[PDB]
Paper text:
[name]-[name]-2 utilizes a trimeric [name] for attachment to the host cell receptor angiotensin-converting enzyme 2 ([name]) and for the subsequent cell entry step which involves the fusion of host cell and viral membranes. Given its crucial role in the viral replicative cycle, the spike protein represents an important therapeutic target and is a critical antigen in host immune responses. All emerging variants contain defining mutations within their spike proteins, with multiple mutations clustering within the receptor-binding domain (RBD) impacting both [name] binding and antibody neutralization escape, while mutations within the highly antigenic loops in the N-terminal domain (NTD) across these variants reduce antibody neutralization. Given the rapidly changing mutational and antigenic landscape of the [name]-[name]-2 spike protein, a structural understanding of spike protein mutational effects and the discovery of broadly neutralizing epitopes is of importance.
To identify structural mutational impacts on [name] binding we next determined the cryo-EM structures of variant spike-[name] complexes. The resulting maps were obtained at average resolutions of ~2.6–3 Å. All mutant spikes exhibited slightly higher affinities for immobilized dimeric Fc-[name] when compared to wild-type. We did not observe major differences in spike protein expression across the variants, and all mutant spikes tested demonstrated marginally enhanced ACE-2 binding potencies relative to wild-type. These complementary assays demonstrate that the totality of mutations within each variant S protein enable slightly enhanced [name] binding, suggesting a contributing factor for the increased infectivity observed for these [name]-[name]-2 variants. Superposition of local RBD-[name] complex models revealed no significant structural changes. These structural findings confirm that mutations outside of the RBD do not modulate the positioning of [name]-contacting residues at the receptor interface via allosteric mechanisms. Our structures of VoC S proteins in complex with [name] demonstrate minimal structural changes in the RBD, reflecting its functional constraints in cell attachment, only permitting mutations that preserve the [name] binding interface.
Author numbering:
A (entry chain B): 299 to 620, 641 to 675, 691 to 694
B (entry chain C): 14 to 68, 77 to 143, 153 to 176, 185 to 247, 257 to 298
C (entry chain C): 745 to 827, 856 to 892
D (entry chain A): 745 to 793
E (entry chain C): 943 to 1041
F (entry chain A): 992 to 1041
Amino acid sequence: TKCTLKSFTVEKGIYQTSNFRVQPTESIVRFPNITNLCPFGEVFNATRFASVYAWNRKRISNCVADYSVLYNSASFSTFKCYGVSPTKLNDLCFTNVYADSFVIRGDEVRQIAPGQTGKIADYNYKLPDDFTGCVIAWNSNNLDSKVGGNYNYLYRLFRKSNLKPFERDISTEIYQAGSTPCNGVEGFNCYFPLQSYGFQPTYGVGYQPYRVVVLSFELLHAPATVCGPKKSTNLVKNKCVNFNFNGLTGTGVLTESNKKFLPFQQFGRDIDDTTDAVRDPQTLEILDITPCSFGGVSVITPGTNTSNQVAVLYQGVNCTEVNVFQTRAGCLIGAEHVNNSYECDIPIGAGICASYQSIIA
Amino acid sequence: QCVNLTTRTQLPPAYTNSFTRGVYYPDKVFRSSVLHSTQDLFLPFFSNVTWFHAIKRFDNPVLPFNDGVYFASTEKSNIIRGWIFGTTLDSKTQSLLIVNNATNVVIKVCEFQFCNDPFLGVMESEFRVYSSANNCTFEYVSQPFLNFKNLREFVFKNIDGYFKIYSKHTPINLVRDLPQGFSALEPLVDLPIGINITRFQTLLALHRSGWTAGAAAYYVGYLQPRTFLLKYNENGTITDAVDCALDPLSE
Amino acid sequence: DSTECSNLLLQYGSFCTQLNRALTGIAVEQDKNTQEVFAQVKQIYKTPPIKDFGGFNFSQILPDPSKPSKRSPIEDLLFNKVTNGLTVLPPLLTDEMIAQYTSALLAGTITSGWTFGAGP
Amino acid sequence: DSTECSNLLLQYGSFCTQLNRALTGIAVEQDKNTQEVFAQVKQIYKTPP
Amino acid sequence: SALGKLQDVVNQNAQALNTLVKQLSSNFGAISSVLNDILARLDPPEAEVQIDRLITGRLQSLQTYVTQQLIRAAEIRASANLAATKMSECVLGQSKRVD
Amino acid sequence: QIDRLITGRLQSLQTYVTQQLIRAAEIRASANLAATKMSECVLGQSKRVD
Ligand SMILES: *[C@@H]1O[C@H](CO)[C@@H](O[C@@H]2O[C@H](CO)[C@@H](O)[C@H](O)[C@H]2NC(C)=O)[C@H](O)[C@H]1NC(C)=O
Ligand SMILES: *[C@@H]1O[C@H](CO)[C@@H](O[C@@H]2O[C@H](CO)[C@@H](O)[C@H](O)[C@H]2NC(C)=O)[C@H](O)[C@H]1NC(C)=O
Ligand SMILES: *[C@@H]1O[C@H](CO)[C@@H](O)[C@H](O)[C@H]1NC(C)=O
Ligand SMILES: *[C@@H]1O[C@H](CO)[C@@H](O)[C@H](O)[C@H]1NC(C)=O
Ligand SMILES: *[C@@H]1O[C@H](CO)[C@@H](O)[C@H](O)[C@H]1NC(C)=O
Ligand SMILES: *[C@@H]1O[C@H](CO)[C@@H](O)[C@H](O)[C@H]1NC(C)=O
Ligand SMILES: *[C@@H]1O[C@H](CO)[C@@H](O)[C@H](O)[C@H]1NC(C)=O
Ligand SMILES: *[C@@H]1O[C@H](CO)[C@@H](O)[C@H](O)[C@H]1NC(C)=O
Ligand SMILES: *[C@@H]1O[C@H](CO)[C@@H](O)[C@H](O)[C@H]1NC(C)=O
């Protein structure tokens, strides 16, 4: 009070000195139930993969993409992400996901990157320099190699020009390396551009088949629907917590509600358009949001000439949320309530007054 | 597969009064016993809505979408099954298909080649609404939405790449025109489509015994940007509304 | 509850203190207004138990013993006919004490004339 | 008459409604003041000829 | 309409409070009216500017509310002084003042 | 540019409305005094000095 009044002597009276803030204790972040996961089973766990010249592109939309399952797997040899970090993949949201799947050699995994040069980059699969996504590769000697030799995987060996980014070339026309016309027959200076791989299980690690899945993340002006799985903190009631329900955030005490919402309604507003009721997304129940008991802190004191005893009034604050007495004005601490009635010396409010005789109310 | 329908009878389109229909919930927010003023695409009160019949009448034209579409249906025996949404209605651009067949409702955003006269047929064993589907960007299968006995109100909006479908089912017993009353349309589904739509076409179902058109009637209204004053009761349903630009009393 | 907002708000100085002080002045002014209007007597007068006033009836303006609020029928009718950092401070004088002050004024002006306003 | 200005002005809320309300209150207050000062009789008295 | 004078005061105070709450939903030229959205969607160099715009708009609204409350407080104080004068002169005595 | 002009003009208009409210309060007090004089000096004889 001396600090607020800028004086070392305080006259008898009540002085509003501060404000009492209930501090938030927990953070409650409830978003909808984790359902409709993205079809990563049909990409990673596919029985057969495509050739690199005819790489499969799968469009992933309208689902929840859990990237932590892929990142924490020990089954992948390469998980190199370009243009984004793996840690924030599980949080961000994208409009569509392009999953390109193919099989290449062990030594050719390095060429699946922006700015690289090689047979795969120039003639089979070209990545843009400004690429946002991740390149995942793993050894598949167990599945894609047979003892006789697996010749079901093809790659383009020759093309007149380098491929554009995200281009698929499935043409089977004879490559013309010379001035002479090929005439459709494979003779001299004219070679068939698609050549088969010969995967065998007894091969070296640089020649063993590797399954590569490249995920391309783009953002377009359409509503982004491939989002990460927002985690849900367990619900805590009857305490002043910071709530985040389906992107609506605030601070309040969440108590049970008797308001019967219609099934399409999620939040509740009063006359002043402030959210005072809400529906929990995980469990369809209605919760009232009571604002935390913020109040004014007033100091009731007699003159410093008489005594140094003081009392504290928390305005509009119940006594269970802070010589403690409950008044309609608020909670009064440091004053002894008496049943006798005297003239008003220091006004407290709601018919309550304080005086010095100790400090009585 | 496409079939031209050449047995139609030429007739001018009808017009009628909207009365106090076309109101929908602007948001997913509960409000109790309060009056809320909102600025949104709303249908004007007592406006001129176009009236189309199915009786030999088979009205399936292509109409401009404008800023939103109010679809009213005085329906018996479930002739009306879905809608056609797009800009050019061909494979050049991307179009939205809404269909309700005998089992479920299917919503697809793809590059479709639409027929000039698309329809279904009734056991339901005739589907002649498209010839191709090339590049799909969104698929969504949901629960089925559905004297004239049923009144179906729908509101379609394209705002910020969001497609809002609002709907209401009403039990009516009026023979010919729209009944006069108040019924607020609940929001049914929001679609992440992100596509341009400027034209639409209704999808009907044929009755086969050539073809026969079942008795149905529908109304098209256009949404305009305006302000409504909505009344919310104790239970939180919109029971009455005021159009702020209709007359000075409501203003 | 934004800490960055409060840190930026501190750059603007003592605007918040001025607004709080002005509102506090208004709040104490309302109590002073009520004190000036109603608390003009320091003796709480009561009417005699027998309401023999020479034919004059004051039942509509005297407090009703049947009512818990100790208000007059006219006062009861009057009370029935009147229907983010924000707090509402309660008034210093409750409605019961204001009704008691009006009752004291009525008892003084009925039993003592204008004498109670100028002395004993 | 600029529609862009009004669209930007709507971002600031109901300041204009408050100012219009205050001016309307002052305007009706002036008529109330004149009514209170001069219209203290409901009978129009006339002097004898 | 017998008790219109008290009802007008109650309506004006409630309406002013309602307007003060509704001024929070206005962005005042910022990208959003929510501080959390600005803090989460932008870096501190531009979030500082947007928060500053919200602060100046809300501060202007609060100053407007306090100013109009002060003017209404002056009016109510004048009315209360008149009421105290009527209490002293009409109830506690007989007044010769006409009307 | 319109944001700068809007904030300047809004501040000017708010200042004008505040001045008008204060002057209206002063004129209301003067009118209440004038009504009191009309009641007590014209419609009756007043014993109040000056
Ligand atoms: C039904 O009639 C429409 C309208 O004429 C036919 O659409 C035309 O199809 C031809 C086919 O080459 C095009 O050249 C025209 O430009 C189309 N016109 C329009 C307006 O679309 C449609 O083909 C007919 N259906 C069948 C099955 O023949
Ligand atoms: C004073 O007036 C009151 C109210 O006008 C009288 O109370 C009424 O008494 C009659 C006779 O029994 C009842 O029918 C009325 O219902 C009473 N009114 C109320 C409001 O209770 C009262 O009798 C009068 N006289 C005295 C001496 O008190
Ligand atoms: C794919 O196979 C591995 C190996 O069995 C398994 O652990 C994983 O769960 C499967 N699915 C995905 C999506 O990786
Ligand atoms: C959410 O899932 C929990 C179990 O994980 C279940 O008890 C609850 O009913 C679900 N809620 C909805 C709305 O699906
Ligand atoms: C509706 O429009 C048609 C033509 O578009 C017109 O003939 C008719 O009179 C209109 N109805 C009303 C009520 O304006
Ligand atoms: C309705 O369409 C869906 C989507 O193709 C299909 O799965 C279902 O079998 C269809 N039902 C009938 C009766 O045709
Ligand atoms: C769209 O489809 C055509 C033919 O079906 C195809 O050539 C084209 O590449 C496709 N485009 C996209 C973006 O899918
Ligand atoms: C939407 O389509 C219409 C008609 O084809 C066209 O005029 C308009 O420019 C398009 N709008 C956008 C944003 O593509
Ligand atoms: C709310 O619904 C209950 C029953 O569900 C009904 O009795 C009551 O009248 C309704 N209240 C209003 C204001 O419509």
